[PDB]
Each structure stands twice: as structure tokens, then as C-alpha cells.
Amino acid sequence: FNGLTVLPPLLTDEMIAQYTSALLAGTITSGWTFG
Amino acid sequence: QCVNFTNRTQLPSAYTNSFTRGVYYPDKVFRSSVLHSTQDLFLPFFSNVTWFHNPVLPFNDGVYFASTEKSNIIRGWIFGTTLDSKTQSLLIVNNATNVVIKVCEFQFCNYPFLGVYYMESEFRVYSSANNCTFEYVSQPFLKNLSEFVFKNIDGYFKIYSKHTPINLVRDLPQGFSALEPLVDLPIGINITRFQTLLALHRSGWTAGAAAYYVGYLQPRTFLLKYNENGTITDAVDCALDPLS
Amino acid sequence: ETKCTLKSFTVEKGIYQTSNFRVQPTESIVRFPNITNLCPFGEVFNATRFASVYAWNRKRISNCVADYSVLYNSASFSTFKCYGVSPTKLNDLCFTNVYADSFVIRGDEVRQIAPGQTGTIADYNYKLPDDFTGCVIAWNSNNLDSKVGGNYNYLYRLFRKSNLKPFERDISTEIYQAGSTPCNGVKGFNCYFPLQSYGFQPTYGVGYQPYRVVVLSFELLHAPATVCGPKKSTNLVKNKCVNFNFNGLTGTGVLTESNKKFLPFQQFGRDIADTTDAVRDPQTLEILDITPCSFGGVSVITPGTNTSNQVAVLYQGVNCTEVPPTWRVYSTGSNVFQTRAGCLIGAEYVNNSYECDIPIGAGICASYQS
């Protein structure tokens, strides 16, 4: 580089996948009631 | 007028912690209730400073001098390069009468002193002085802690001072107080070394507890806090701590 | 004015900002220190003998009152040129710690007296800083500094181990080693004396006639002023927007008896970004505080040129006590009113209240019935 930097995102992709899995399992099992 | 001595008095120069001493008003501009950041030659916080209980010491960038003195034993100052009639030097003497300053090529022997007679008439600090330019007389400079800051910048010799009643025994007090400007000298001299002058009872000299603190100055950046009355009451060093 | 700024002969019913007004200053106040004494320029200009270039004679000038007109009209000065200030304004300012450097040098090297200039004496005898301020004066001195035997009193350096920092004085006559073999302090091969002597002879014409040079250097507000111009002070007034010149510090505003506490060494004050909020006058030594005299925008309220040709003028954020663009016509006996937005001229306040047209501000709004 030449004085420019790229910072990493706070939430890693594994954590994002975990959120999506949680959402999708909840909506499969509970419905809308879990919101 | 001076003869050598045999009792080679030596001051046990110990080291102590500077804490937060050596803050002076940088400019002649009134300000109030404001945080002002300035970069100048200061004395870094929490540094080590040399405390003595008469060697020649380098001047370097600047000098912080202090004396928590009783009865005002310390008398004068001598600055220069070689301290001889060959090279111009600076002398300051503050006796019981008006302080007197000269810039001359004085001639010094091994140890200069005033001396007192007991009705006091005794002065044999130097011997000869051939040629010089500037002289000055003004009000005298001086249990009580007296602080002085000596700077030599751009042909200007700035001398700042402060006085404070002190009751603490030994260490430099855990307090904070700015140093108001006292005098400017509009002559440039190659100041690199300096001495100190005392007042001995010349009847046999008896003066051994010449305790004073000495420190050197470095260029750094400070943040200063002016209250409602425009009095420097708090400061923060920059290049000391990640928090700072 | 609304037609002029909106570029139409027809203006619709609304409020339009036209311009802004400023209270004009009255008279002027010049206040200089009461000290008066002639400034000794003759001896620095009529000294019989001058030193060499590497021993340029420096003198400090302070605590004097100086006129530069006499130094201006003097046609004897071959060259008279200033860098940081106009030569005609020299007798209009106040400095402190003036420096006068006088010497005798080569007329061919007179161009070397300039910032960012490299020559022979410019780099090895006397160097100017790039940010130099002041004036340079030079005039021919063949009759004085040249003799039929040749005046060798004037030496100048040729060999140096390095360059010169600006404003230095070097007189060290050490032998110079021009080869790998060390001279060991002994002159010989590759060992030459750095200084060389001028051979000023009256037989030589222009370009070899020695020249006398004096350089004046100033400061710009780094200390209390001590060398003011030949101007004369005058009295001060308060509670009026005037132009003031406190010891070279110019400004325009209204002065008042200040209330802050100044320390004896403190001259003036400011709070944020060069806003000089107080001054100690050089004569009375009294603290006064400064504030710029009032100003603000102006707006118009019209019911629409299709309906009527009456207007109401609003001065924004200004106390109605002082208002009379000239427009004194709307200051004689017309109805006036005050509000949080400013002062309203040409409209009349009313008891009753109802949903309204064109707004003004702070909950107050206007319309056409007057």
C-alpha cells in the first residue's frame, strides 16, 4: 500500500452466518411469535 | 582578590523526581477560561532532577533552577563558555540592595564569593575585566521556595521567576504554579556553562548546606488551562503517556 | 432594490433578502506612547571607517523616534529597496528591536543581498534568511574605501568546510586543507588561507569601486513596541464606532471601559482565533475592551407589486435604538417596532391574532390590511 489502510469489519462472516441460522431456525419452528 | 582553599566541600548530588515544576507563561497575551495548546521548550513531567546538599555545569537548551531556601544564602549567577577575560560572560548579583547585571569579560579564580563582614563590606568575586558592553540595575530578585527559569533564545535571555512559601521538608512540593515573566535581556551570548554564587561568613567560610535543585529543558508540547482570571492553573504534557 | 436583485419588473408577494448594512465609523483615534526622542541615525550612517564583510558591524536601535523621510529623499543612496514593507509606509508603523548592519562590499555583489541568493559573500561571508524583512541601502564609496596604494584592510572568505546559516558572524582564520594529505596546521600544497584581501584602487572604474551597504531589519509584533513613527497621538473617545490605531495595532470598532483583570506584564487579550478583546493604551495605561460596531442583514416585506407599492423594512438582529443603504426617509416619523428577529419599520403591531400570510420570525408574521 501507499498510506491507505483497509480495516476489517467488526462482525466476521461466521458470526453473520450464525445470525442467519438463528433467524431461520426460529422462523421455521416458532413462526412470527419469536419477533 | 582570592586565595585557594583546602576543605574541598563536595555536595552529594542525589536524584529526585521533577513532578510538575517548570511551567511559565509563554506569551504576553491575556486569555481566560480557555484550553490553549502550545509547543515550546519546557521541563518534561516526572523527570529526574539533580539535588545538591560549586561545580561547573552545562547550560544546554535551558535551565530550571530552584531553592527552597532559608535566609537567602544563595547570591548570584555566572554564565558563559570558559569563564575568563578572553570570552564574554554574564554575571548577575542580587545583594541586599538593587540587583545588578553585567555582561563582561570578567576574570575568575578557582572560587568566587562575596563574603560578609560583621557593617557588611566585602566583595572579591572577580579580579579583572577589560572590555564589555551592557550593564543593568533594578529591584532585587529576592522557608521560601524560589524558582527560576533561564532561557537563551534568539539573542534574548529570558529569565522567569516565582516565589512560594514552603513548609514541606525536603522533596520538591506536589504542587502546580506557573512562572510569570520577570526580565528580558536583549543581547546574544554563547551560553553553554554556568556556576553558582553564595554568601559565606568571612570573619572562615561556613556554608555547606547549599541545597538546590537543577534541571534541563527539552522541546515539547503542552496543553494549558486558563481560568476566569487568566491564571495558568493546570497543564498536561503530551509525549509522556498514551493517556496524555 | 428588490426589483434589481430579483431581476423582474414584477415582484410576487413575499419576503426577499436584499442586502446588509453596517454602522459607519466616525473620526479616528491614534494613540502612541508619550515618549519622544530623536533617533541616532547619523553615527550609523556617517561612521568614517567600516569593517570587512565577514565582520559586518551590527547595531541595535531601540527607544527612539525615527523619521524615514530623510532616509527616503537622500539621492546619495545608489540603491534603496525594501522587501517586507512599502518604503513610503515606514514612518507609519511602530517596531521594536531594530537592527542595523553596516559594512563595505563589492558593488558587483550587491545582487547577492537577497533571500534565496547564492554567491561568494552571500554563502561564505554573510547570508540572508529567506524570510527577511526590512530595507537595503547601498552607495558608492570609492573616494573613502579606496587608496592609491590599495586598501587591503577588507578581507573576505573563500574557503569553508560548509555553508553559512543566515545571520552569522565568522572570523575564524583556520588554514584550509584542499587535498587528501592533511595540512596539520601547516600551509603548503593543497593548503591555502581561506581569506583573500581586496585590492581597492581608484584607478579601477565602476564595478571595482567599493560600495557601502547598510541593512535594516525589523520585527513584527514580538515584543512591546519601542520605536514608533514620527506621527502624533490624539485623544480617545468611547461608545462610538470609530477607527483606532493602538500603537500600530489597527482596527475599527467601539471602545468601552473594560472589566477584566490584567497582569502587569500582560498588554492585551483575546479569546478564540485572534479576536483582540482588550487593549492597554500606551499613554493612560488603562484597560479598554473592544467590540465591532453593529451590522446585519436587511429584508423587505411587500404585499405584491400587483396590489400596492408600500413596503415594510426589517433590520435583522439589531436594536432599534440606533438604525439611521442610507434610507433616512424611513427614520423620520414612520412607525417603528421591535421584535426578537430585529427591528421592523413601516408596519404597525395589532392586538388581535389570526392565521397569517408572509412570515417574519419568532412567531411574528405580517400582512396587508397599510
Next chain:
Amino acid sequence: FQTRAGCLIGAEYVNNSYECDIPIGAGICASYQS
């Protein structure tokens, strides 16, 4: 400590998990207990 975001001096790394206080990066963050 060496982490995907860089290097950390003056902080002790633990095994526990809490809610985030001062987001440092790469999924890890710091707090005060030391």
C-alpha cells in the same frame, strides 16, 4: 497479544464471552474489570 486486527499491548486475553463494550475488531473487543 496478536490478533487478526493487529497487536494488543496491555490487555489480557480470556476465554469467557460477554457483550461487547469497546469494539476492537475481527469479532473481538475489550472491557474493564484490569
Next chain:
Amino acid sequence: NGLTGTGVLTESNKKFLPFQQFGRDIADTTDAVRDPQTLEILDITPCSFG
């Protein structure tokens, strides 16, 4: 050999043709040099900042 730059140098596994003198990657940033003495291929990395 006149190519001036600052960085950390390592050995490289790139394969120059027998007539180049140095390489670069993109946007005109030099990336590998061949030494005028030994004629061997090195690699350049800008030493870290942050």
C-alpha cells in the same frame, strides 16, 4: 543500478526472461529486481506501517 526504493528484500521464485532487469505488478509499483552482480531474482515488500 539506479532503481531506488525502500523495503525489505527476500529471495523470489519468479521467472524472468533472460533479458529483463526488473518487474512490477500494477499501477506502476516495482515488485522484483535482478541484482547487477549475481543476476539473481529477488522480491520487494514495503516494510510495515500502521
Next chain:
Amino acid sequence: SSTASALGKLQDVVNQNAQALNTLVKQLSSNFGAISSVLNDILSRLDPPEAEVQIDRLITGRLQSLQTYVTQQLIRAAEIRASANLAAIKMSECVLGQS
């Protein structure tokens, strides 16, 4: 009544506006390459032909700063307008009826 720092949005909006004004006004104290940061001094010191040069440098610097300030203001105003439209919608749906 007790818990503080519950109004971060309004407070930081005010702080951003104050910071913009403060940096704008502080920018008036920069030489930009000229010999001074105060215009009256160069007016009162030197000859108008080069006063043109110095004043030109001042003018270009100050214009640049002012333009930057104005553009930032435009962006921030766009954000505030988006939030205000959202607030009006929420007042319509939630206050004047059940959502």
C-alpha cells in the same frame, strides 16, 4: 430523570454543527503561504501591487474552506431531511391510528 446520555442523537447533531462552525472560524488564522494571517497588516505595510498577490492567496484559501463547509452542510441537511420524513410518517401511522 436519573439515567444520563439517553439523548445521544440530538446531542451529537448539535456537536457536529458546533465542530463545523469552530473549524470554519479557526481556519481564518492560516497563512496559506502568505506573509500574514491578518489582512489589515499587509494592507498597512506594503505596496498594493504585491498586496494583490498576498490578498489573492488569502482569498483562494478562504474560498476553498468556505466551499468545503457548505458542501458538508448540504450532506448533513439531506440526512436530517430523511429523518424528518421518517418522523412525519411515524406520526401519521402510529399516533393517528393503529399500525
Next chain:
Amino acid sequence: EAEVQIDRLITGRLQSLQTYVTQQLIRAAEIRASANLAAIKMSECVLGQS
């Protein structure tokens, strides 16, 4: 004149950097609008029937 040339370089690179920052700001505004839309969609279609 070296300082003059440096001044030219400095002002040019300043203009370039400022332009970059302004473009970044505009693009960030666009992305934020899109993200708000996504949050609404995911709170109204995933967590309940619309």
C-alpha cells in the same frame, strides 16, 4: 523554487484527496439508504406476514 514545485504537488494531491472523500460520502449515503430498506424488509417480511 523547490518550495514552489512542492506547493504545486501539494495542492494537486489535496484536490485529489478531497474529491475522493466527497465521492465516498455520497456513496455512503446511498448505501445507508439501501441498508435501512433492507432492515425494514427483514423486519416486516421475515418476522411476519406482510
Next chain:
Amino acid sequence: ICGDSTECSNLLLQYGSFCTQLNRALTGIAVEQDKNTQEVFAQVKQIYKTPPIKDFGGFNFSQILPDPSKPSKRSFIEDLLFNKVT
């Protein structure tokens, strides 16, 4: 930019109308602010008043309704909000 200088004004004049659209933009912003507040709050056409006697089945809106004692006529929560933020 100039600050009461004829010379500076004359020099700036030859830049064209750089700083007429500046004032135009600032005024547009201010007018936009007034419109924002107007359209957010002025959703109503009349000014309704709660009756002097209040018995809403058991609910207590006293902390929310204005108190005639305070000259500001702002409710308790509104007073808290106004005092908190500076």
C-alpha cells in the same frame, strides 16, 4: 472572506458569482428546516382542549398533559427533556 476592505472586495469581484449560490444554498437549507418542523408537527387543523375534569377509566396522563402552573405550559417529561440536554 474580506472583512471591510475595498481592495479585497474588488479583487474578489473578478472571481465571478462564486458566493451568490453559496447564500442561495444556505437560505434554501434554512427554509427547508422551517418546512421540516411545519410538516412534522402541524398535522392538525384545530386546537383541541382536554376537559377540566378528567376520569379516563383509571389512566393517569398528568405527567404528560401540560401543567397550568408552569408559565412554559410544558409537561413534566417535556421539562425533564428540556433541562437535560444543553
Next chain:
Amino acid sequence: ICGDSTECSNLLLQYGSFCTQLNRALTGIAVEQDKNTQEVFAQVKQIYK
């Protein structure tokens, strides 16, 4: 801008605080991005399986 040069830095000094102002915006952008992701995805209180 200066590419590790001293004289360039000194010349750049007299431009005032442009760089503080510039770098104060990129930080806002980055914080905004993190907030965007958090408010899009972190809609739930627990983690289900």
C-alpha cells in the same frame, strides 16, 4: 502527500488543519458501516438451533 519528507511536511503545515477534518469523516463512514450491519442482522435476542 509528502511521502516521508521533512520540507514537504513543513510546507504543508501552513495549510491549517485540513487533515484532521478529512480523517474525521472516514471514521464516521466506518462507524456507519458497522452500525448498518448490526441493525440489519442483529434482530434477535437469543440464538436458536
